[PDB]
Design an enzyme around this catalytic site. Structure first.
Site, PDB file in Angstrom:
ATOM      1  N   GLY A  13       0.764  -1.226   0.000  1.00  0.00           N
ATOM      2  CA  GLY A  13       0.000   0.000   0.000  1.00  0.00           C
ATOM      3  C   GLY A  13       0.802   1.287   0.000  1.00  0.00           C
ATOM      4  O   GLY A  13       1.984   1.302  -0.362  1.00  0.00           O
ATOM      5  N   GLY A  54       5.346   7.786   1.071  1.00  0.00           N
ATOM      6  CA  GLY A  54       6.145   6.588   1.187  1.00  0.00           C
ATOM      7  C   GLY A  54       5.295   5.393   0.821  1.00  0.00           C
ATOM      8  O   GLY A  54       4.153   5.270   1.276  1.00  0.00           O
ATOM      9  N   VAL A  55       5.861   4.554  -0.046  1.00  0.00           N
ATOM     10  CA  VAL A  55       5.286   3.262  -0.394  1.00  0.00           C
ATOM     11  C   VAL A  55       5.583   2.197   0.650  1.00  0.00           C
ATOM     12  O   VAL A  55       6.621   2.233   1.268  1.00  0.00           O
ATOM     13  CB  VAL A  55       5.703   2.811  -1.780  1.00  0.00           C
ATOM     14  CG1 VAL A  55       6.969   2.006  -1.749  1.00  0.00           C
ATOM     15  CG2 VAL A  55       4.601   1.983  -2.367  1.00  0.00           C
ATOM     16  N   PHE A  99       4.014  -5.555  11.253  1.00  0.00           N
ATOM     17  CA  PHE A  99       3.035  -5.950  10.242  1.00  0.00           C
ATOM     18  C   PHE A  99       1.572  -6.176  10.603  1.00  0.00           C
ATOM     19  O   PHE A  99       1.265  -6.907  11.526  1.00  0.00           O
ATOM     20  CB  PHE A  99       3.407  -7.303   9.671  1.00  0.00           C
ATOM     21  CG  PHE A  99       2.581  -7.655   8.496  1.00  0.00           C
ATOM     22  CD1 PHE A  99       1.811  -8.784   8.501  1.00  0.00           C
ATOM     23  CD2 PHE A  99       2.621  -6.849   7.364  1.00  0.00           C
ATOM     24  CE1 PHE A  99       1.069  -9.093   7.390  1.00  0.00           C
ATOM     25  CE2 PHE A  99       1.903  -7.169   6.258  1.00  0.00           C
ATOM     26  CZ  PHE A  99       1.126  -8.285   6.267  1.00  0.00           C
ATOM     27  N   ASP A 110      -6.676  12.740  11.050  1.00  0.00           N
ATOM     28  CA  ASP A 110      -6.941  12.136   9.739  1.00  0.00           C
ATOM     29  C   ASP A 110      -7.366  10.683  10.015  1.00  0.00           C
ATOM     30  O   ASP A 110      -6.890   9.726   9.383  1.00  0.00           O
ATOM     31  CB  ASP A 110      -5.649  12.151   8.885  1.00  0.00           C
ATOM     32  CG  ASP A 110      -5.907  11.889   7.408  1.00  0.00           C
ATOM     33  OD1 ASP A 110      -7.051  12.150   6.973  1.00  0.00           O
ATOM     34  OD2 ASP A 110      -5.062  11.349   6.644  1.00  0.00           O
ATOM     35  N   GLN A 141      -8.984   3.722   5.909  1.00  0.00           N
ATOM     36  CA  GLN A 141      -7.699   3.348   5.367  1.00  0.00           C
ATOM     37  C   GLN A 141      -6.554   3.459   6.359  1.00  0.00           C
ATOM     38  O   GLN A 141      -5.483   2.857   6.130  1.00  0.00           O
ATOM     39  CB  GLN A 141      -7.315   4.017   4.043  1.00  0.00           C
ATOM     40  CG  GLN A 141      -7.916   5.366   3.624  1.00  0.00           C
ATOM     41  CD  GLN A 141      -9.390   5.337   3.263  1.00  0.00           C
ATOM     42  OE1 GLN A 141     -10.230   5.738   4.065  1.00  0.00           O
ATOM     43  NE2 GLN A 141      -9.699   4.907   2.049  1.00  0.00           N
TER      44      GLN A 141
END
Lengths: 5, 296, 258
Positions: free
Chosen positions: B11, B16-17, B82, B127, B131
């Site tokens: 994602g 940043g990826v 993770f 925020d 997501q």
């Protein structure tokens, strides 16, 4: 503004 | 970085990826946020600056853990614990079945313990959105992405122009309030609670003004009884249509009376009366809270 | 509101200890001095006024400079580059929109490159271990102002002024925590405007008695008396604005009545 030198 | 083997991209989110990776030596799976160092013209993004300094201070089961920062000439890497997915996708994948009510309750309960921990450490998140909420297979949910997050040891000044998404934005900010408070986070949570409950965004609006108006259509147009001072707020207009408060039993049918209670307190217009994370965790809705696991 | 005021204040008290600079650091700096550090901070106060930065940004920048100088020795030729990257980092943390790097180059009169300033940004984060959420005097004063019995925005301004003045002078002010500096400034500013004194509310919240403040108060009273005379003037010239009720025009009390 440059300070010192 | 040597010790990490990229497995796959999982994602994005604020700069940043984000890749999944494993430590070749311990075997732990982690999530690397790889920040593109520009290298050269703005340096280190402010998002990363804040995410790192704030996350380094918050340690809690319901806030995503920052394991290590890997800081080289050309790249910053952030190593996170993770987690298997975000709520957004789970909600799409559980659409039509519905997310089981009891998982909803555990989730809201967990998010409020996290929020509670942030606010009592002078952090706003600012925020909150599906997501940015992360779930694992054992039923936990954790707040993620503190890139827009601010410390409020001094009141946090309001964004000109903002940046953010609508949808989960509080009405005080929409009406041109000068500062944020903790209360904005609560309002976002209450929209996410509804969204879990009804399967669709509570307030899915297409501009700042239409956002206001979808909120007003559902909770009623405010005035000085419900919200001392609104009429003197910068973006308030006497031309606002007068709507009525809909019954919460049609806004969120499936919820019981305790739930509708807590929701009504999370979406109170006046920020000073809106329930705090700490108080909501004492609410009767959580008496029979458990910890079910999702079908993922 | 207040569900969190106590928790936050307590935690700000924990964090201030962890973000303390070493007090005796200047004497271990070969090439640089308290007086050169006073030039640098004064200059930041100007830079902050030029680009309309918040006051928090300034205090945070000063905290970064002190912690960095606690571990790292710096030539005079490079102090301002340390200062400029501190100010960049602080703005990135605290401001809604930071001035671009270019503007941070510009304000030194193009003496360092963008690439230098960016490389020093990197090195400041490494030595600070990305710990940028330091408690300041400004943070503590703001909480304290909650306990003002009627509020009075001359007291508020005048305390801010005193707290910024403590930024300038390393000796003595490094010996004091920001929470104590702010106790002093609040009482001092209170005293000066209305003649009242450091209130029991805050005595029991902070656990500081007037008399525990006494030493810091004495140091800050002198600075307040001596301000017109100081080599460094940016903060006085900032605090003549009607924005700040020209509190810096006001008249320091010649005695403190302790």
């Amino acid at each position: 503004r440059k300070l010192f030198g | 970085m040597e010790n990490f083997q990229k497995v796959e991209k999982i994602g994005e989110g604020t700069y940043g990826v984000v890749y999944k990776a494993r430590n070749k030596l311990t075997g732990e799976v982690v999530a690397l946020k790889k920040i593109r160092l520009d290298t050269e013209t703005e340096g280190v993004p402010s998002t990363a600056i804040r995410e790192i300094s704030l996350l380094k201070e918050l340690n809690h089961p319901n806030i995503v853990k920052l394991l290590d920062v890997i800081h080289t000439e050309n790249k910053l890497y952030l190593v996170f614990e993770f987690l298997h997915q975000d709520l957004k996708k789970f909600m799409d994948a559980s659409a039509l079945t519905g997310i089981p009510l009891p998982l909803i309750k555990s989730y809201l309960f967990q998010l409020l313990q996290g929020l509670a921990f942030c606010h009592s450490h002078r952090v706003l998140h600012r925020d909150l959105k599906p997501q940015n909420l992360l779930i694992n297979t054992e039923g936990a949910i954790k707040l993620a992405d503190f890139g827009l997050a601010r410390a409020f040891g001094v009141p946090v000044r309001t964004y000109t122009h903002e940046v953010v998404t609508l949808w989960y934005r509080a009405p005080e900010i929409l009406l041109g309030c000068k500062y944020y408070s903790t209360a904005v986070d609560i309002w976002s949570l209450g929209c996410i609670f509804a969204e879990m409950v009804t399967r669709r965004a509570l307030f899915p609006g297409d501009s700042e003004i239409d956002q206001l108006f979808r909120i007003f259509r559902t909770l009623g147009t405010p005035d000085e009884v419900v919200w001392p001072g609104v009429t003197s707020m910068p973006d308030y207009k006497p031309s606002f249509p007068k709507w009525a408060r809909q019954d919460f039993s049609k806004v969120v049918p499936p919820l019981d009376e305790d739930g509708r209670s807590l929701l009504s307190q999370m979406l109170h217009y006046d920020p000073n009366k809106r329930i705090s994370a700490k108080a909501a965790l004492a609410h009767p809705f959580f008496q029979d809270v458990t910890k079910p696991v999702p079908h993922l | 509101v207040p569900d969190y005021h106590e928790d936050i204040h307590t935690y700000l008290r924990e964090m201030e200890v962890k973000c303390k600079p070493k007090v005796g650091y200047m004497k271990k700096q070969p090439d640089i001095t308290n007086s050169m550090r006073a030039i640098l901070v004064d200059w930041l106060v100007e830079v902050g006024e030029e680009y309309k930065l918040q006051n928090e940004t300034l205090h945070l920048a000063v905290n970064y400079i002190d912690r960095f100088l606690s571990s790292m020795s710096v030539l005079r030729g490079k102090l301002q580059l340390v200062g400029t990257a501190a100010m960049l980092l602080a703005s990135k943390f605290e401001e809604i929109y930071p001035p671009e790097v270019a503007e941070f180059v510009y304000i030194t009169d193009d003496t360092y490159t963008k690439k230098q300033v960016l490389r020093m940004e990197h090195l400041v984060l490494k030595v600070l271990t990305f710990d940028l959420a330091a408690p300041t005097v400004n943070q503590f004063l703001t909480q304290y102002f909650l306990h003002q019995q009627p509020a009075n925005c001359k007291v508020e301004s005048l305390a801010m002024f005193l707290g910024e003045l403590s930024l300038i002078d390393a000796d003595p002010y490094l010996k004091y925590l920001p929470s104590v500096i702010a106790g002093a400034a609040f009482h001092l500013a209170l005293y000066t405007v209305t003649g009242q004194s450091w209130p029991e509310s805050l005595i029991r919240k902070t656990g500081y008695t007037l008399e525990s403040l006494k030493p810091c108060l004495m140091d800050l009273h002198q600075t307040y008396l001596k301000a017109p005379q100081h080599a460094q003037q940016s903060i006085r010239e900032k605090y003549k604005n009607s924005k700040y009720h020209g509190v810096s025009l006001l008249n320091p009390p010649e005695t403190l009545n302790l």
